[PDB]
Design a protein around this ligand. Structure first.
Ligand SMILES: OC[C@H]1O[C@H](O[C@H]2[C@H](O)[C@@H](O)[C@H](O)O[C@@H]2CO)[C@H](O)[C@@H](O)[C@@H]1O
Ligand SMILES: OC[C@H]1O[C@H](O[C@H]2[C@H](O)[C@@H](O)[C@H](O)O[C@@H]2CO)[C@H](O)[C@@H](O)[C@@H]1O
Ligand SMILES: OC[C@H]1O[C@H](O[C@H]2[C@H](O)[C@@H](O)[C@H](O)O[C@@H]2CO)[C@H](O)[C@@H](O)[C@@H]1O
Ligand SMILES: OC[C@H]1O[C@H](O[C@H]2[C@H](O)[C@@H](O)[C@H](O)O[C@@H]2CO)[C@H](O)[C@@H](O)[C@@H]1O
Ligand SMILES: OC[C@H]1O[C@H](O[C@H]2[C@H](O)[C@@H](O)[C@H](O)O[C@@H]2CO)[C@H](O)[C@@H](O)[C@@H]1O
Ligand SMILES: OC[C@H]1O[C@H](O[C@H]2[C@H](O)[C@@H](O)[C@H](O)O[C@@H]2CO)[C@H](O)[C@@H](O)[C@@H]1O
Ligand SMILES: [Mg+2]
Ligand SMILES: [Mg+2]
Lengths: 121, 121
């Protein structure tokens, strides 16, 4: 059962473990790069890195996928945009009015799949 | 209390976003370093970095806390432990028979709070 629990006090500035994202892309997502950790292969070209602010999170996202992840775009709650990066294959699926918590997946020479954990609002 | 969705195909090798953890600690946790990214202050002493292996996840965790995070220790499904790090203040809470998915929190000069996202078995 998926859940969360908070320990500690009320001080400080919020942070997420998911602190930055970049991709390598061409026709597909060759790689997704999460906090600088690379998942996938070395093809395509490297995107800029998106670094989240305190309290900033992915609120909406569009993922195109087939056998692999074709394309990623997202928007944050601060209205900032990442992508689209990738190609035009697959079909699109969207998350709307969410808070993304984690990005897991599977990768080889490319990014095969994503398993996105999020809160739905 | 949260959900997940999968996108893409069945190829490649699985990965988890949460792949390394270190802390700075004294009396409290001054900081937590997740996938290399520093959250918190510059006090205390830097712990070794725990780098997760293939198929490894936190299955047991004990956090002491009050206004801040006083102490952390955890064990993985593969029997590999981190800590205890920190002090003996606050009060203790344990999660067990879990799979930790993400660590968020809040931090200033110290680690004020941790929000642990997990599957509960
Ligand atoms: O993102 C995957 C690759 O995209 C491009 O590769 C294309 C290539 O441009 C095209 O001639 C060929 O027919 O298809 C491949 C993809 O299957 C990039 O040039 C590569 O760097 C990427 O790996
Ligand atoms: O998500 C990537 C692409 O997945 C499918 O393409 C497969 C195709 O099904 C298979 O016959 C061929 O051998 O491999 C390609 C991927 O290289 C979708 O049909 C495409 O729309 C996607 O771009
Ligand atoms: O991420 C896409 C696939 O990557 C790998 O497949 C490679 C294979 O390792 C290599 O020997 C061959 O030359 O190219 C293929 C990619 O076409 C993984 O082994 C697959 O599981 C992934 O789907
Ligand atoms: O982990 C927080 C800090 O713990 C110690 O600081 C102590 C200090 O040793 C003691 O003299 C004072 O009375 O209390 C503070 C904590 O409130 C470490 O020495 C520091 O490096 C840490 O930042
Ligand atoms: O988690 C850190 C400590 O939090 C509390 O101590 C606070 C106390 O609540 C506050 O009134 C005072 O001003 O600061 C101290 C921190 O030194 C818990 O009572 C302690 O057990 C915790 O160690
Ligand atoms: O993480 C503990 C707190 O760190 C900062 O608090 C500072 C504050 O900025 C400074 O003016 C004062 O002198 O010291 C405290 C540390 O106790 C954050 O601003 C707080 O939100 C955190 O709780
Ligand atoms: Mg408490
Ligand atoms: Mg400050």
């Amino acid at each position: 059962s998926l859940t969360h629990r908070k320990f500690g006090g009320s001080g400080g500035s919020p942070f997420s473990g998911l602190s930055s994202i970049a991709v390598r892309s061409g026709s597909y997502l060759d790689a997704i790069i999460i906090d600088g950790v690379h998942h996938g292969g070395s093809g395509g070209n490297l995107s800029p890195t998106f670094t989240f602010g305190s309290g900033e999170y992915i609120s909406n996202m569009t993922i195109r996928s087939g056998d692999y992840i074709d394309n990623i775009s997202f928007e944050t709650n601060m209205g900032r945009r990442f992508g689209p990066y990738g190609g035009s294959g697959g079909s699109a699926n969207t998350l709307s009015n969410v808070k993304v918590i984690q990005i897991n997946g599977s990768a080889g020479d490319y990014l095969d799949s994503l398993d996105i954990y999020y809160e739905q609002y």
